[PDB]
């Protein structure tokens, strides 16, 4: 199954430099939605997940053909709660009609992550948009209450390694948990519309205790009010993993780089660039632009 790379005709760095700061706008003045945490991390929790359909044995899913607009994947229940990000974007397709959903949502995600602070995504343009019939099942994305080796397992499929899933998942700690989306509440840390390695100083520093929410649930809960799915906390039952949330605890840039790594590459998975291809884009952020 091969997805070549198609840049949307005629289109420049300029062009999706527009489509950026339209999303970055949006997210300066749609404030206080969930709560005055704005649209930030629903936007890169999108990315992910019409990413994290990829399986790399076939390459099927993934995000290039941008099949989460279409009624199966949109419906997944592991989906649940992105119809608010995906609304988020429609005004902004609808002015810029012509660039791909699966462009589109990638980079509400490269967005999302700049304008929260994180560190700079390279991101590539042409993917494109790909028929109902290519939707893949419900059931790729992963499972919150399972163990370190499931966490290493699903992942294998998404062909990512150790400090990749670990850098991955650290994902600034962003938003928070919804108990009517996922049966979880709370959230990872206290700044969570800011990009930082919070989640590895917290999971390494609070007090976690092991409770049962009114989904009747396990989560881990903290003192400080901070949650930790199961899957977060399997980080540092596993000695791997531990090690580096670790490395990651002490050294913000180091994490920032890997996490700009994992994240391009996960947003890639499947697609085939020609070599012609224009190189990645740098978006500069609102605040460098003076915006
Ligand atoms: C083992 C992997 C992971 C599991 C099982 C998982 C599970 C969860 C679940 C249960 C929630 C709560 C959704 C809600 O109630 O609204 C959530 C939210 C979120 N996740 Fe993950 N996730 C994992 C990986 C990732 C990774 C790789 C990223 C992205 C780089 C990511 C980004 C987010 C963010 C930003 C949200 C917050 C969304 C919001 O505030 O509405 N997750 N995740």
Known sequence: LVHVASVEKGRSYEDFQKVYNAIALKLREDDEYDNYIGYGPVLVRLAWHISGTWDKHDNTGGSYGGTYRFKKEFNDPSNAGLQNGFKFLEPIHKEFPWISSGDLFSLGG??????????????????????????????????????????????QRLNMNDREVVALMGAGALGKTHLKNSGYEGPWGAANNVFTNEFYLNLL????????????????????????????????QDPKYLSIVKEYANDQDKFFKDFSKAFEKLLENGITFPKDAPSPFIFKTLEEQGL
């Open 110 to 155: 490269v967005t999302a992550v700049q304008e929260m602070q994180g560190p700079k995504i390279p991101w590539r343009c042409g993917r494109v948009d790909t028929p109902e019939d290519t939707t893949p099942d419900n059931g790729r994305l992963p499972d919150a209450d399972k163990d370190a080796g499931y966490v290493r397992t699903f992942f």
């Open 205 to 236: 520093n609070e007090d976690w205790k092991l409770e049962k929410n009114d989904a009747n649930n396990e989560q881990w809960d903290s003192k400080s009010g901070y949650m930790m799915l199961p899957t977060d906390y399997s980080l540092i």
